[PDB]
Amino acid sequence: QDFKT
Amino acid sequence: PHAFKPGDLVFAKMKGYPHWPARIDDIAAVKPPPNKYPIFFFGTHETAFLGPKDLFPYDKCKDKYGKPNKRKGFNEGLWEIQNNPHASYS
């Protein structure tokens, strides 16, 4: 998971 | 109409971005808060947690939001949702 800011 | 379930294709709205091609992901991982879903954004391959109020069914809404943008990653995302929406982008 690459969390969107 | 039914509740969103993993694999459903949508346009997803986040603060300060256009409605973006995306899919409801499987939580198989940080788990969303109540009545929010994990969202994989096509193009940038990022994740976030959004409630249904920001989630727009793909085939109903694509005529409205599926037009190319000049925004980094958007057109790539249109390609992804149109050609292999259920692939691994890991």
Author numbering:
A (entry chain T): 76 to 80
B (entry chain A): 2 to 29, 32 to 93
Publication passage describing the model:
The PWWP domain comprises 100–130 amine acids and is often present in chromatin-associated proteins. Our structures revealed that the overall fold of the PWWP domain consists of three motifs: a canonical β-barrel core, an insertion motif between the second and third β-strands and a C-terminal α-helix bundle. The canonical β-barrel core harbors an aromatic cage constructed by three aromatic residues, which is a signature feature of the Tudor domain “Royal family”. Taken together, similar to other members in the ‘Royal family’, PWWP domain also exhibits methyllysine histone binding ability.
To shed light on the molecular mechanism of methylated histone binding by PWWP domains, we determined the crystal structures of the PWWP domain of human BRPF1 in complex with H3K36me3 and that of human HDGF2 in complex with H3K79me3 and H4K20me3. We were also able to co-crystallize HDGF2 with both H3K79me3 and H4K20me3 peptides, which show very similar binding mode. In the HDGF2-H3K79me3 complex structure, the trimethylated lysine K79 is accommodated in an aromatic cage formed by three aromatic residues (Y18, W21 and F44). This trimethylated K79 is the major contributor of the histone binding to the PWWP domain, although histone H3 residues Q76 and D77 also make two hydrogen bonds with V33 from the insertion motif and T50 from the fourth β-strand of the HDGF2 PWWP domain. HDGF2 binds H3K36me3, H3K79me3 and H4K20me3 weakly. In all these complex structures, the methyllysine binding aromatic residues are from the loop between the first and second β-strands, the N-terminus of the second β-strand and the C-terminus of the third β-strand. In these complex structures, the insertion motif is directly involved in histone binding, forming one side of the histone binding groove.
